[PDB]
Write an enzyme that holds these catalytic residues in place. Sequence first.
Site, PDB file in Angstrom:
ATOM      1  N   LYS A  53      23.242 -12.997   9.183  1.00 41.89           N
ATOM      2  CA  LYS A  53      21.814 -13.368   9.285  1.00 41.89           C
ATOM      3  C   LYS A  53      20.894 -12.596   8.349  1.00 41.89           C
ATOM      4  O   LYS A  53      19.717 -12.936   8.228  1.00 41.89           O
ATOM      5  CB  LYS A  53      21.304 -13.148  10.718  1.00 41.89           C
ATOM      6  CG  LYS A  53      22.026 -13.959  11.783  1.00 41.89           C
ATOM      7  CD  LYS A  53      21.882 -15.460  11.564  1.00 41.89           C
ATOM      8  CE  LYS A  53      22.305 -16.251  12.802  1.00 41.89           C
ATOM      9  NZ  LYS A  53      21.926 -17.688  12.674  1.00 41.89           N
ATOM     10  N   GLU A  60      26.946 -22.029   6.706  1.00 37.18           N
ATOM     11  CA  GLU A  60      26.303 -22.833   7.762  1.00 37.18           C
ATOM     12  C   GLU A  60      25.883 -22.005   8.977  1.00 37.18           C
ATOM     13  O   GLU A  60      24.762 -22.129   9.468  1.00 37.18           O
ATOM     14  CB  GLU A  60      27.239 -23.962   8.233  1.00 37.18           C
ATOM     15  N   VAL A 101      22.604 -19.900   9.091  1.00 37.35           N
ATOM     16  CA  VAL A 101      21.313 -20.556   9.354  1.00 37.35           C
ATOM     17  C   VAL A 101      21.319 -21.271  10.713  1.00 37.35           C
ATOM     18  O   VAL A 101      22.330 -21.846  11.113  1.00 37.35           O
ATOM     19  CB  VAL A 101      20.947 -21.528   8.205  1.00 37.35           C
ATOM     20  CG1 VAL A 101      21.275 -20.899   6.855  1.00 37.35           C
ATOM     21  CG2 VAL A 101      21.662 -22.865   8.344  1.00 37.35           C
ATOM     22  N   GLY A 115      18.022 -22.927  13.229  1.00 39.12           N
ATOM     23  CA  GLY A 115      16.643 -23.159  13.733  1.00 39.12           C
ATOM     24  C   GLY A 115      16.331 -24.635  13.992  1.00 39.12           C
ATOM     25  O   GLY A 115      15.162 -25.064  14.004  1.00 39.12           O
ATOM     26  N   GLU A 163      10.859  -6.715  20.874  1.00 38.91           N
ATOM     27  CA  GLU A 163      11.428  -5.371  21.056  1.00 38.91           C
ATOM     28  C   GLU A 163      10.315  -4.316  20.983  1.00 38.91           C
ATOM     29  O   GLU A 163       9.153  -4.664  20.717  1.00 38.91           O
ATOM     30  CB  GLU A 163      12.572  -5.095  20.067  1.00 38.91           C
ATOM     31  CG  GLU A 163      12.187  -4.681  18.658  1.00 38.91           C
ATOM     32  CD  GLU A 163      13.404  -4.304  17.819  1.00 38.91           C
ATOM     33  OE1 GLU A 163      13.301  -3.402  16.949  1.00 38.91           O
ATOM     34  OE2 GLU A 163      14.474  -4.911  18.036  1.00 38.91           O
ATOM     35  N   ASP A 199      10.675 -11.656   9.732  1.00 43.95           N
ATOM     36  CA  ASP A 199      11.729 -12.599  10.115  1.00 43.95           C
ATOM     37  C   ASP A 199      11.441 -14.024   9.597  1.00 43.95           C
ATOM     38  O   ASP A 199      12.321 -14.692   9.039  1.00 43.95           O
ATOM     39  CB  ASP A 199      11.896 -12.628  11.636  1.00 43.95           C
ATOM     40  CG  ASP A 199      12.949 -13.629  12.083  1.00 43.95           C
ATOM     41  OD1 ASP A 199      14.077 -13.552  11.555  1.00 43.95           O
ATOM     42  OD2 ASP A 199      12.653 -14.535  12.912  1.00 43.95           O
ATOM     43  N   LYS A 224      13.401 -16.523   6.638  1.00 41.16           N
ATOM     44  CA  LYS A 224      13.805 -17.900   6.849  1.00 41.16           C
ATOM     45  C   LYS A 224      13.151 -18.833   5.847  1.00 41.16           C
ATOM     46  O   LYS A 224      13.741 -19.839   5.470  1.00 41.16           O
ATOM     47  CB  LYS A 224      13.534 -18.321   8.305  1.00 41.16           C
ATOM     48  CG  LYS A 224      14.496 -17.659   9.283  1.00 41.16           C
ATOM     49  CD  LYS A 224      14.033 -17.801  10.724  1.00 41.16           C
ATOM     50  CE  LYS A 224      14.968 -17.074  11.696  1.00 41.16           C
ATOM     51  NZ  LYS A 224      14.220 -16.746  12.951  1.00 41.16           N
TER      52      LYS A 224
END
Lengths: 388, 402
Positions: A104, A128, A131, A133, A176, A187, A191
């Site tokens: 990731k 593959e 990823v 989402g 967190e 993050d 993406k």
Amino acid sequence: KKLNIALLGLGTVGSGVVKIIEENRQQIQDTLNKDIVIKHILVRDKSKKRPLNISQYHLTEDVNEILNDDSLDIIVEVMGGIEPTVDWLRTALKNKKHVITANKDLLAVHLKLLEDLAEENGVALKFEASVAGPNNISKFMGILNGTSNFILSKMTKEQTTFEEALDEAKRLGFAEADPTDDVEGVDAARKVVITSYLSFNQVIKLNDVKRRGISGVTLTDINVADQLGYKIKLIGKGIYENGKVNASVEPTLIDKKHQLAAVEDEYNAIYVIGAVGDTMFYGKGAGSLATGSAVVSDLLNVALFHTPPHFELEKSNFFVVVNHVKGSIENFENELKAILPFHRSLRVANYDNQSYAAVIVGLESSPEELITKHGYEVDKVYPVEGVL
Amino acid sequence: HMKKLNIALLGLGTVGSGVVKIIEENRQQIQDTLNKDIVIKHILVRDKSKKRPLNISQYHLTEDVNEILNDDSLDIIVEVMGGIEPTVDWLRTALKNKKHVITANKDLLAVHLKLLEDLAEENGVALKFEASVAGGPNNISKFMGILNGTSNFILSKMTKEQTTFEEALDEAKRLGFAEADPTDDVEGVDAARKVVITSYLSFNQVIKLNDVKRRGISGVTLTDINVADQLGYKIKLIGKGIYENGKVNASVEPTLIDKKHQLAAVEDEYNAIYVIGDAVGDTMFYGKGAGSLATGSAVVSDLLNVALFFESTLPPHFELKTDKTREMEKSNFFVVVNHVKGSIENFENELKAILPFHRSLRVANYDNQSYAAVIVGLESSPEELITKHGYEVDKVYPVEGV
Ligand SMILES: N[C@@H](CCCC[NH3+])C(=O)O
């Protein structure tokens, strides 16, 4: 045929990969005439407990034991990290081993160099599972971070401050203790880099993504946006124009009728524009079992084992908040009309004491510097999307 | 070292013409890239005297399907004709003759796809039907979809512009969405076919078209829409498949959808499939329907795939995921009653007394001596029960997203 594989890492995803292979082993033999042998599993620490429980696989702490094993056909990497992980994968590919990764932390630069090295060495690189989402795409917009979306939904629906909403996300498990990666949009920006690479075949760097998080979004922003017909979301966006990708992550007003406006709580979505109608994919982030299932799918594909095109034969909108404004809202609107370059439309709203907000449709760039040079105090500017 | 791939087309409508054009325009590229030369050796047409564009006259046109089925030099048959009979038998023959089959046949149902997939596997050849379905795809337990663009367009128009069904349908006709006989759209038949297909793809179960309980949108009124609205719901034509205890319950009907549900926001001619599973989150795919060029483009895509894996996944294979071990529903209804004497408070009280246990009840004025109730959390329709207590029930719609 025996297919000898090694796993790099054994967290929840790695354990899931193992269980899925075990559970389907006889079927994979009977159906595809392939016998998958997990010959090595790299772990950081052999003592730790795991979802597999005590098992029958060979666990090692030495990656070289795996990289030097010429009997291996495929390396499955579920470790995460850039260093030393990417170098491990470069070595595997140079040694003519197929690589399947669910890492990731990989960015476009990493996927590009690995894909080329793979092609160069006549082996597959499958990412593959990395990823979670998948047609000429010109633009995408996404809600790409569950925690920040959860927070904005909470603020919106329950009328809480950002601080209250973040504390609630912390106690509920979403955020967190240091929530920076979520809240500052990092993050989401990662993406956006990955989505740009997949959508446009262009490599951008994480620091090329113009990024602003949600920590400065207030209830006032939300409620003013609401009255104007908009929600506020943290939107990751990639626009591909004239050979170049403009990528960003930032708080954005989204028209309430837009498909993205309805995406609430920890759900994510990617909205793709291209020629053809818009499309959207909606769901939460995978999914240890889903990630593991995607890895095993890529594995069977490689076991059953280039590209792609075919025959052909915009302004920006902005939400501007200005403070320390003397005079009426009508006067502010008139002044703004006089100052702005040509644009399509303008609406103004009360924001707070001596503060007004404006939504301006059809500018080429942010009017922030301009409004500042005319002597106003601009608090902030957010893009506005979904305008029809 | 270039291998010739000899193909035949069954049918030459807009999709067939598009397939031909796409192959022509990409032929040199497919040779240079994949080292494959695609030759359209035969095109089956209904009437071969008919005037056609110039490009078509370069191909060999025939009216005899046997000329194609008996040609041992053919590698692949591309069917874009439509129909069940005799079309499915043509495809059975092709597969028995060891020819790969690519189909965009919109009339194929689950029964047909099943028997063709088995026959293909049995004969060591591919059956590709991607083009036969419009996009927008492991343990799926339920799906709900907006599966017909025209009906959704009409409901959006009624809702946003406050028109009657009749006015909205006429507008859809004028705007190009509905056809002159819009029955297939408006009565939910198209949507029911897609529910059969979606159930086959989601659950690996074959159901028949007539197993889909179906009601169209022609009885939805502006009053239904506005009363739903005040209660917090939109109305959509929803195609639904629920897979419980080895069995699929499938339906298409007007359904109230909570305004906050992702499906509620799907407007105009857009479609969407919303998928629910254990134990993952919900997912949804959103987009418009195809698309002659899109259908044609999907056919050619399937064609190149079969070409690439020519010299080399069984339909029976499913990946078992009951290591979910290691890692780790009621119904709602909108009921309209007419000829009700007495107040809304009295109607609500009577319902509270007569209904079996449920999660919530809200009532609304519908029209003169008419009330509507939304009831959340029943095991089955309260229609018979309400009827035996002396109320005229106009209709009942399911309610989702609660
Ligand atoms: N207005 C019609 C609508 C038809 C509904 C049919 N289920 C009626 O009174 O019932």
